[PDB]
């Protein structure tokens, strides 16, 4: 079934428009580039806190450092300023500076990096950028974009929005981060579509990757808003 109940092949434009080159050259051309399974070429959309944010066709299984150095002149403030990177896209969790170095953007390597290839829409936050604030617009963006049919997504992201609003402000207790963990996994795999799961991965990745920083901001709220 599909549109008006008809068979309909939904293919991403990048996969559609690369299909020429694999029919004009063959599978050897596509498979030679990129790692096992993850092969070919994809538009890596370097942006965020990068010196020269642009969209470049790029090989996958590419180290992050030369991804931003060669094609963009580096990350603003260097790697030390770089606190984390969202390499794949929104549905791909961010990973810390101690992990980025030269992780390869091949689907398997993001999986071991607890993230995904997404659409290679890689964006960077510097140290000056608060990671709690960095995804603050991201998580509320997911809430602003949800059809709301299934209960986990309709009641999830908005509830996640409010509980994190007091998180970035710091009006919460240390247990509240654990509750945010619990309901994030609760909506995971329980929504009709992948928007909820797509919204789950960003917040899910942040919790298990910069948890002490999340616990850092809250007593900062407590000392002055006592």
Partner 1 sequence: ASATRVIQLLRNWASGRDLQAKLQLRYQEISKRTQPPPKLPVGPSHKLSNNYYCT
Tell me which residues touch ligand SF4 (CB under 6 A): 146-150, 153-154, 191-193, 195-196
Q: Annotated binding residue at 5?
A: no
Residue 181 binding target from ligand SF4, partner 1, none, CB below 5 to 8 Å by type? partner 1
Q: Annotated binding residue at 226?
A: no
Q: What are phi and psi of 50, to 5 degrees?
A: -105, 145
Residue 56 or 183: the one with the smaller Cβ distance to partner 1 is 183
- The answer to whether residues 21 and 30 touch, using CB atoms and an 8 Å cutoff, is yes
Residue 121 or 172: the one with the smaller Cβ distance to partner 1 is 172
The site for partner 1, by CB under 8 A, has a size of 6
Q: Which residues, at least 6 apart from 217, have a Cβ–Cβ distance to it below 8 Å?
A: 130, 132, 167, 168, 170
Residue 192 binding target from ligand SF4, partner 1, none, CB below 5 to 8 Å by type? ligand SF4
Residue 196 binding target from partner 1, ligand SF4, none, CB below 5 to 8 Å by type? ligand SF4
Q: Which residues, at least 6 apart from 21, have a Cβ–Cβ distance to it below 8 Å?
A: 29, 30
Residue 127 binding target from ligand SF4, partner 1, none, CB below 5 to 8 Å by type? none
Distance of CA 186 to the CA centre of its chain: 19
- When binding is defined by CB under 8 A, the residue of 29, 79, 181, 221 that contacts partner 1 is 181
Helices assigned H by DSSP within the chain: 13-24, 27-32, 64-70, 78-81, 97-100, 107-112, 131-134, 136-144, 151-169, 174-187, 194-207, 211-224
List binders of partner 1 among 137-176 (CB under 8 A). 175-176
Minimum CB separation from ligand SF4 for residue 93, in Å? 17
CA gap 99, 119 in Å, rounded:
20
CA gap 27, 10 in Å, rounded:
21
Residue 148 binding target from ligand SF4, partner 1, none, CB below 5 to 8 Å by type? ligand SF4
Dihedral, 119, 121, 125, 126 alpha carbons, nearest 10: 120
Minimum CB separation from partner 1 for residue 163, in Å? 10
Neighbours of 195 (CB within 10 A): 22
Residue 69 or 188: the one with the smaller Cβ distance to ligand SF4 is 188
> Residues annotated in the binding site, as ranges?
10, 12, 15, 119, 146-150, 153-154, 191, 193, 196
> Residues annotated in the binding site for FMN, as ranges?
10, 12, 15
Q: Which residues contact partner 1 by CB under 8 A? A: 175-176, 178-179, 181-182
């Amino acid at each position: 079934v599909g549109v008006f109940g008809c068979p309909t092949t939904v293919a991403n434009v990048e996969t559609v428009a690369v299909s020429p080159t694999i029919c004009r050259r063959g599978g050897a051309w596509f498979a030679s580039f990129g790692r096992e399974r993850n092969s070919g070429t994809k538009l890596f959309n370097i942006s965020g806190h990068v010196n020269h944010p642009c969209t470049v066709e790029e090989e996958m299984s590419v180290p992050l450092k030369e991804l931003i150095e060669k094609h963009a002149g580096g990350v603003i403030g260097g790697w030390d300023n770089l606190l984390a990177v969202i390499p794949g896209g929104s549905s791909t969790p961010l990973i810390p500076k101690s992990v980025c170095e030269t992780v390869l953007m091949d689907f398997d390597a993001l999986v071991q990096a607890q993230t995904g290839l997404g659409t290679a829409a890689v964006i960077v936050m510097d140290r000056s950028t608060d990671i709690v604030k960095a995804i603050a617009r991201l998580i509320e963006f997911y809430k602003h974009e949800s059809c709301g049919q299934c209960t986990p997504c309709r009641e999830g992201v908005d509830w996640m929005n409010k509980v994190m609003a007091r998180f970035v402000k710091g009006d919460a207790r240390p247990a509240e981060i654990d509750s945010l963990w619990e309901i994030s996994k609760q909506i995971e795999g329980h929504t009709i579509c992948a928007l909820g799961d797509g919204a789950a991965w960003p917040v899910q990745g942040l919790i298990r990757h910069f948890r002490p920083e999340l616990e850092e901001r809250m007593q900062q709220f407590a000392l002055q808003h006592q």
